[PDB]
């Protein structure tokens, strides 16, 4: 694989994120606690149950506890550098043992070639997955009641790029057109 050190980051989840795709459809690891692997001191470990969203387009979504493998170049080994994807779940299983799983579903969404948006938020009813007009609509809900604090982009090899933006409790004015889509919006606190 040819990768960047994305696995070393545990980016604050906050309230949620939105992703601009443009096209490898991005793979994410999300959880409540983030730190180092105890053998090699590399950043990138998640503790307890971790949410894995692995596109392969259908989304493979799992909520499992990860137990890193100790073989050569695995997260439990001294010579480890980083895990990567090249089904997405089978590549993860090469680096981690997946145990104590409470959730697993596959979402057939049916995306096109055109630009795509994807989002993740969390509330009392679980983790809400949104997808795209370029408006985000809810397509799935995942029964995770453990607050997500961090997310990680899982490195991939086959170029392509995507952008991740944080969500905030902002007040917006939303302009709906004749087809019922939001075509413009005002971020009220942006400017005068």
């Amino acid at each position: 694989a040819f990768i960047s050190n994305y696995s070393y980051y545990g980016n604050p989840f906050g309230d949620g994120i939105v992703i601009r795709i443009g096209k490898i459809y991005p793979a994410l690891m999300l959880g409540s606690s983030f730190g180092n692997f105890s053998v090699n001191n590399k950043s990138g470990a998640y503790f307890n149950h971790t949410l894995l969203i692995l596109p392969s387009t259908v989304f493979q979504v799992a909520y499992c506890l990860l137990q890193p493998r100790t073989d050569s170049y695995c997260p439990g080994n001294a010579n480890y550098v980083s895990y990567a994807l090249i089904n997405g779940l089978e590549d993860i299983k090469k680096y981690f043992n997946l145990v104590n799983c409470t959730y697993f579903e596959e979402f057939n969404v049916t995306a096109d070639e055109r630009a795509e948006w994807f989002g993740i938020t969390q509330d009392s009813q679980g983790v809400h997955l949104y997808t795209s007009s370029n408006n985000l609509f809810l397509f799935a809900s995942v029964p995770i009641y453990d607050k997500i604090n961090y997310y990680t982009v899982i490195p991939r090899s086959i170029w392509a790029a995507f952008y991740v933006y944080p969500l905030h409790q902002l007040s917006y004015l939303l302009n709906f057109d004749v087809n019922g889509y939001i075509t413009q919006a005002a971020d009220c606190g942006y400017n005068d």
């Binding site: 694989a1 050190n5 493998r69 170049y73």
Partner: peptide, 18 residues
């Protein structure tokens, strides 16, 4: 586990603000 070549510098040249 598969071997990875991690070279973060390569992924800077593709930076494009959106």
């Amino acid at each position: 586990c598969p071997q990875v070549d991690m070279q973060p510098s390569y992924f800077i040249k593709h930076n494009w603000p959106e």
